[PDB]
Amino acid sequence: YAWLIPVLPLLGALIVGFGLIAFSETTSKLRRPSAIFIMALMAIAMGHSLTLFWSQVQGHLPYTQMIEWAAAGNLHIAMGYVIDPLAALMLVIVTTVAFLVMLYSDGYMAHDPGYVRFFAYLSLFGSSMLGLVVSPNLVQVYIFWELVGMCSYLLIGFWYDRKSAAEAAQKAFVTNRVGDFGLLLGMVGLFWATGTFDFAGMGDRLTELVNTGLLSPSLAAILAILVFLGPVAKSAQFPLHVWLPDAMEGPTPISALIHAATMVAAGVFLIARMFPVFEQLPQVMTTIAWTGAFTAFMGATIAITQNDIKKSLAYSTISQLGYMVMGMGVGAYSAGLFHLMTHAYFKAMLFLGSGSVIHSMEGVVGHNPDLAQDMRYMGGLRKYMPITGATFLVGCLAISGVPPFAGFWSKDEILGAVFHANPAMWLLTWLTAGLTAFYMFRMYFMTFEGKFRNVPPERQEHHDHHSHHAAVPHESPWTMTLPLVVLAIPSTLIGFVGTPFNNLFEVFIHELYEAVFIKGCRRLARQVLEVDYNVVDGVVNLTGFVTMVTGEGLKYLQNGRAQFYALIVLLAVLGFVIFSVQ
Amino acid sequence: AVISVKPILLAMTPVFILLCLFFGTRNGFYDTDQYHGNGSAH
Amino acid sequence: STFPWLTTIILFPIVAALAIPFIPDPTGKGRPIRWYALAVGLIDFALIVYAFTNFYDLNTPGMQLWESYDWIPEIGLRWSVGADGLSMPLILLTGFITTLAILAAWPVTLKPRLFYFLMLAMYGGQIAVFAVQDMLVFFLAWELELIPVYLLLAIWGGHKRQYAATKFILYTAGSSLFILVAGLAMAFYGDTVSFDMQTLAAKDYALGFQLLVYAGFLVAYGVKLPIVPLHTWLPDAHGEATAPVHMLLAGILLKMGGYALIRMNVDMLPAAHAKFAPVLVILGVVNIIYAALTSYAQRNLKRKIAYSSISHIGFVLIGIASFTNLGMSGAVLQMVSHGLIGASLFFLVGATYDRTHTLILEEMGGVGQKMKKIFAMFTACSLASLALPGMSGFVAELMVFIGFATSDAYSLPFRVIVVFLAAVGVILTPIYLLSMLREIFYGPENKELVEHEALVDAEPREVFIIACLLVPIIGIGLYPKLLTQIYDATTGQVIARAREVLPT
């Protein structure tokens, strides 16, 4: 019954979402029992997942339940679920934080008019992310790549009455589709070749055609690259760096939703679930070393050049992912095993913490700035404020590394793995990695104690009502302590399990090119719109016109004057004899 | 094993028929404002 | 199993349409005659279910509701109906959408006596295309929906009505004659004068003779299923139409060209299909590329979806000309998916035009602020077209992609350049749909709100039709064996018959 945890937030999305489209006069009044409804089913979804996580490692490890999806003559498609430690751990990294966003957004959105629709999105968003982490096939990671990408379009375009989030939500879907375009070619390329869709089949079937020679290793070189086109177009790189700037053009817990538990649950999981595909081609590992190092450079070098904590923290998600492709780029995935689960444990604890900084400043946001969501304009969140600025201390410091805290074991083995794999290309990363710890400390100093402008102490729907830019004293949300009681101890409980190479969860769980193309495809669209039609509407201009002008041309054969009619009768008599003797 | 279309098409068909007969009664905007009027695309 | 089932299903809405001129109470607009069309529409679909859930008996090939009567023995034409696994999904689809096409025809009070006549005569005449196993009844039924669709366009339609309906009837009648030319060519080949579709399949035709008949059917079926050089009637006849006329044209009428490609070009003519298959998949690829670029370059919303219907048609044409049991099963699934998907979009385009009265899409913007439920249903149907998984637009396209580049019939450098080019429509479909989704509802800046679009609402009846269309859209997208179980008995025999001619 382990397939129930995908469908249980999905059942929460169909029950709630049908209530809006059919019962709008009642569901908009039942905003509070609806919000606690999916938060019950997600808490149910944890209650089946932690047992599937804790009581699977050091216990009954393997599980593969399959159900046939499509069928033909000697062509079967299967779709089911697996319970693997590489899969069961990946539940807890997302099923906890999906419970965390719906707790945090419950306190954020209180006067929001579209209140019930937001939790209906996260219901379907969480169910789509809980689907592909148990997925055994490349098809079932391509069932839920767009289903995650659809809610990522729906959550950015949540406030549909804002045109800044309108065009941001569409291009977030298209840039997710050009990675999905490669993943679709990545399936059918490796299904023409291997004939299987499971990685247990493709663990043997792939290399049997490479070392022998029925397919060239350069032919499969682009094919494993085409699968890798998925996670790089979903992270705003030098193909199209347009995705992650859209992460802070909508609601505030979307950075915790789509910029914290999507690139780690799709970009990091898929390159780890496909171990026997990348490991057997040395022409692929040199490209995930190339493209993996540059996105750590491209994410960091644009993040210092920023006047806001909105995009620069989202640019930190690009650059910290640049030290996750090197978790597979060097082969030693155990250095990425610690930052597999901790990229949403105390990293998202800042991503929920930084959202509460710009939320308890002025009140509701007009479009961009009216809730004071900009840096270099206000300061003083550590002088006199609530506990929401105290998770800005421990949730920011331990990433560079503190020897008592966790995260010190995160950034030592990722250089310790490249010291044993490829120490000739280490200097290009350490010139960044020594500086990505520097400017992330500037995120602490320029957002907690700085040049103040006004009294930004409250009004994140946490103080009393009618507090537009009027917040003298502080007010802690009731949905802030239970965030700080769960994932804080889990940032220490997972900081001892899977931290070193020999630990608990280490062995038991072992730029404008799109805009140059969207303006490029729009050029050939207007030219092709009247090209092939007008060569057949020229036939309409020929044939539909020469039929009428023949009938207007043969009309003048009838001209009256029946003496002429006696000619054509008698010329036919003269003409049909010479037709019949010849 | 395979879920067959016949026991679920036969189940949903009287659900389908008596709902179109009901949902014809519940309607708005095609009887009160109706600036399209007698037409359908004018 | 002795009652005439398909003969009743064909001839009930034709006969019941004759009581439409005799319906009493003409209280201004036609209210009881609107209910009478839904009466004999719904109970006609109930017979399609009752003949399916009792006397279909699937996982066997051949016809299963067979009734071969005698009409004119002097010619040799018989009233021969019969439903196999190629006919029966589209026969079930025709009864399903036309029950909703009557239910979406409820603002039609212009000439309601004439309207629900020609819509019920197009209900019996559309089922009659997939059901008949004959030639001169097939050409009869193909041209049976010729006048009851001219008059549907030319009366209830936008501006440029009469240009659209006249261009339609000349392309349709002017290419239906090639069904008569080719259907008579096959029945007089050799010594047997049989006009049955099953007897004409087993006849042995020469390869030079078959290439004439294949070119005869391809101009006949490239018009109705719009193969892209013969497609120009489609955005005119769909650019000036209403929403109930749309779901019969996009949902049903385009599928008769795709259905007859599997009957009279693959079963009857396999040896010419081996020679004219690579031209189809290039034509199917440039069907997807051209229509998606032309959809993005268009401002009319009703013509934007009209060109979008040409793109999803291209995945049928790739899947037929691939010689795979999964390629053919993705070709028939693309007919049933787009029939439900294109009916749902075109109903909502007619629902948005009934409020905004513009169809210009530069004169709109911010409509979704006023009406919320039509916007909620417009995205759920637009995302259906995007081949988004969890819905039947994906699995129909997924079987075509997989079923093409696993076939032992083409070369590897030809299979790479097709699946690369046919997957550009994976990128190109969120280009025009989501922008049209953006340039209509997503907006603070609204319209003039004075001349047109003074009202805004969302009826519960209009929600129900989209809700009924999304149950098979999602339900096949979550389990495509709910519809493949009808195919595989017959498409297993269609490809295996075409497998014998493949070493060429």
**Dihedral sign for Cα atoms in the order C346, C467, A129, A258:** positive
Owner of token pair 């700037």: A245
Counts for chain B of helices (H) and strands (E), in that order: 1, 0
Could you write out the DSSP letters of every residue in A388-438?
GGTHHHHHHHTTT-BSSSSBTTTTTHHHHHHTTT-TTS-HHHHHHHHHHHH
HEC assignment per residue over C382-447: HHHHCCCCCCHHHHHHHHHHHHHCCCCCCCHHHHHHHHHHHCHHHHHHHHHHHHHHHCCCCCCCCC
For residues A465 and A468, what is the distance between their CA atoms, to the nearest angstrom?
Answer: 9
Contact B13 C49 (CB under 8 A): yes
Classify strands A75-78 and A68-72 as parallel, antiparallel or unpaired: antiparallel
CB C490 within 8 A of CB C84: yes
Q: Which of B24, B28, B42 sits opposite C38 (nearest CB)?
A: B24
Amino acid A111 reads H
Q: Which of the other chains make 3 or more beta carbon contacts under 8 angstroms with chain C?
A: A, B
Q: Which residues of B touch C236 (CB under 8 A)?
A: none
What tokens does A209 get? 């055609």
Contact C53 B29 (CB under 8 A): no
B3 CA to chain C: closest CA distance, Å? Answer: 7
CB A175 within 8 A of CB A242: yes
For residues C273 and C279, what is the distance between their CA atoms, to the nearest angstrom?
Answer: 10
Identify the burial level of B9 via C-beta atoms within 10 angstroms of its C-beta, where 0-12 means exposed, 13-18 middle and 19 or more buried.
Answer: middle
Q: B16-22, long-range: CB within 8 Å, 24+ apart, which pairs?
A: B16/C468, B17/C42, B17/C43, B17/C45, B17/C46, B19/C464, B19/C468, B20/C38, B20/C42, B20/C99, B20/C100, B20/C103, B20/C464, B20/C468, B21/C38, B21/C42
Contact C464 B17 (CB under 8 A): no
CB C280 within 8 A of CB C225: no
A226 CA to chain C: closest CA distance, Å? Answer: 11
Amino acid A346 reads F
CB A399 within 8 A of CB A347: yes
Q: Which residues of B touch C109 (CB under 8 A)?
A: 38
Identify the burial level of A230 via C-beta atoms within 10 angstroms of its C-beta, where 0-12 means exposed, 13-18 middle and 19 or more buried.
Answer: buried
**Dihedral sign for Cα atoms in the order C103, C107, C112, C117:** negative
Which of the residues B15, B29, B40 would you substitute to probe the C interface, choosing the one with the greatest number of C C-beta atoms within 10 Å? B40
What tokens does A149 get? 């990408």
Contact A163 C445 (CB under 8 A): yes
CB C133 within 8 A of CB C63: yes
* Alpha helix segments (H runs only) across C270-358: 270-275, 278-296, 301-320, 325-356
**Cα separation values, C339 from A291, C149, C346, Å:** 43, 17, 11
For residues A67 and C24, what is the distance between their CA atoms, to the nearest angstrom?
Answer: 56
CB C315 within 8 A of CB C396: yes
Could you write out the DSSP letters of every residue in A310-367?
THHHHHHHHHHHHHHHHHHHSS-THHHHHHHHTTTTTSHHHHHHHHHHHHTTTSS-SS
Contact C350 B41 (CB under 8 A): yes
Residue-range domain boundaries for chain C: 1-504
CB A183 within 8 A of CB A203: no
Contact B19 C464 (CB under 8 A): yes
Please measure the distance between the N-terminal and C-terminal CA atoms of chain A and give it in whole angstroms: 91
Owner of token pair 């029945």: C187
Method of structure determination: cryo-EM
**Dihedral sign for Cα atoms in the order C275, C281, C286, C287:** positive
**Resolution at which this structure was determined, Å:** 3.1
CB A99 within 8 A of CB A485: no
3-state class of A307 per DSSP? coil
For residues A181 and A172, what is the distance between their CA atoms, to the nearest angstrom?
Answer: 14
Which of the residues A143, A191, A219, A225 would you substitute to probe the C interface, choosing the one with the greatest number of C C-beta atoms within 10 Å? A143
Q: Which of C38, C45, C457 sits opposite B28 (nearest CB)?
A: C457
Where b means 16+ CB within 10 Å and e means fewer, A337-350 reads bbbbbbbbbbbbbb
A223 CA to chain C: closest CA distance, Å? Answer: 12
Residues of B with CB under 8 A from a CB of C: 2-10, 12-13, 16-17, 19-21, 23-24, 26-30, 33-36, 38-42
How many other CB atoms are there within 10 angstroms of residue C134's CB atom? 27
Q: Which residues of A touch C424 (CB under 8 A)?
A: 181
For residues A215 and C481, what is the distance between their CA atoms, to the nearest angstrom?
Answer: 33
Owner of token pair 């030693």: A332
Closest CA to A461 of A16, A34, A109: A109
- DSSP bridge pairs for A72: A75
Cα A484 to chain center, whole Å?
26
How many other CB atoms are there within 10 angstroms of residue A216's CB atom? 10
Owner of token pair 């290039």: C282
Closest residue in A to C408 (Cα–Cα): A192
In chain A, positions 130-149, which contact chain C (CB-CB < 8 Å)? 139, 142-144, 146-147
| Helix (H) or strand (E) segment spanning residue A239 | none
What tokens does C478 get? 């979550």
How many other CB atoms are there within 10 angstroms of residue A497's CB atom? 16
CB C456 within 8 A of CB C371: yes
Which of the residues A150, A184, A187, A513 would you substitute to probe the C interface, choosing the one with the greatest number of C C-beta atoms within 10 Å? A184
Where b means 16+ CB within 10 Å and e means fewer, C29-45 reads ebeebbbbbbebbbebb
**Cα separation values, C335 from A164, A386, C254, C429, C468, Å:** 38, 60, 8, 18, 18
CB A358 within 8 A of CB A252: yes
What tokens does A53 get? 């996580």
∠ CA B15-B18-B20, rounded to 5°: 105
Closest CA to A98 of A134, A132, A63, A123: A123
Q: Which residues of B touch C42 (CB under 8 A)?
A: 17, 20-21
Q: Which of C229, C405, C488 sits opposite A71 (nearest CB)?
A: C488
DSSP A198: B
How many other CB atoms are there within 10 angstroms of residue A97's CB atom? 27
How many other CB atoms are there within 10 angstroms of residue A506's CB atom? 19
**Cα separation values, C196 from A24, A432, A499, C77, C190, Å:** 55, 76, 75, 8, 15
Instruction: Say whether residue A94 is in contact with chain C using an 8 A CB cutoff.
Output: no
**Cα separation values, A391 from A380, A474, A499, A560, Å:** 15, 16, 21, 103
Q: Which residues of B touch C116 (CB under 8 A)?
A: none
**Cα separation values, A519 from A107, C286, C295, C438, Å:** 42, 21, 15, 17
What tokens does A28 get? 């908009």
DSSP C267: I
In chain A, positions 62-81, which contact chain C (CB-CB < 8 Å)? 68-75, 77
Owner of token pair 């439920």: C373
- CA torsion angle for A435, A441, A447, A453 (degrees, to 10)? -80
How many residues are listed for chain C in this entry? 504
* Residue A535, CA atoms < 13 Å, CB-side half-sphere: 7
CB A318 within 8 A of CB A246: no
For residues C239 and C235, what is the distance between their CA atoms, to the nearest angstrom?
Answer: 5
- DSSP bridge pairs for A64: A82
For residues A80 and A90, what is the distance between their CA atoms, to the nearest angstrom?
Answer: 17
HEC assignment per residue over A25-68: HHHCCCHHHHHHHHHHHHHHHHHCCHHHHHCCCCCCCCCEECCE
For residues A177 and C39, what is the distance between their CA atoms, to the nearest angstrom?
Answer: 45
Q: Which residues of C touch B31 (CB under 8 A)?
A: none
Q: Which residues of B touch C53 (CB under 8 A)?
A: 6-7, 9-10, 13
Closest residue in A to C444 (Cα–Cα): A161
CB A104 within 8 A of CB A256: yes
What tokens does C95 get? 């009864």
- Which segments of B1-42 are extended strands (E)? none
- What's chain C's Rg over C-alpha atoms? 22
C184 CA to chain A: closest CA distance, Å? Answer: 26
**Cα separation values, C134 from A302, A495, C204, C222, Å:** 70, 75, 18, 21
Contact C241 B8 (CB under 8 A): no
CB A406 within 8 A of CB A495: yes
Instruction: Say whether residue A23 is in contact with chain C using an 8 A CB cutoff.
Output: no
Which of the residues A521, A531, A541 would you substitute to probe the C interface, choosing the one with the greatest number of C C-beta atoms within 10 Å? A521
What tokens does C379 get? 């995205």
For residues C266 and C88, what is the distance between their CA atoms, to the nearest angstrom?
Answer: 18
∠ CA A6-A11-A17, rounded to 5°: 130
Amino acid A552 reads E
CB A324 within 8 A of CB A344: no
- DSSP bridge pairs for C80: C68
Contact C35 B24 (CB under 8 A): yes
Which of the residues B2, B5, B10 would you substitute to probe the C interface, choosing the one with the greatest number of C C-beta atoms within 10 Å? B5
For residues C266 and C269, what is the distance between their CA atoms, to the nearest angstrom?
Answer: 5
Cα C199 to chain center, whole Å?
27
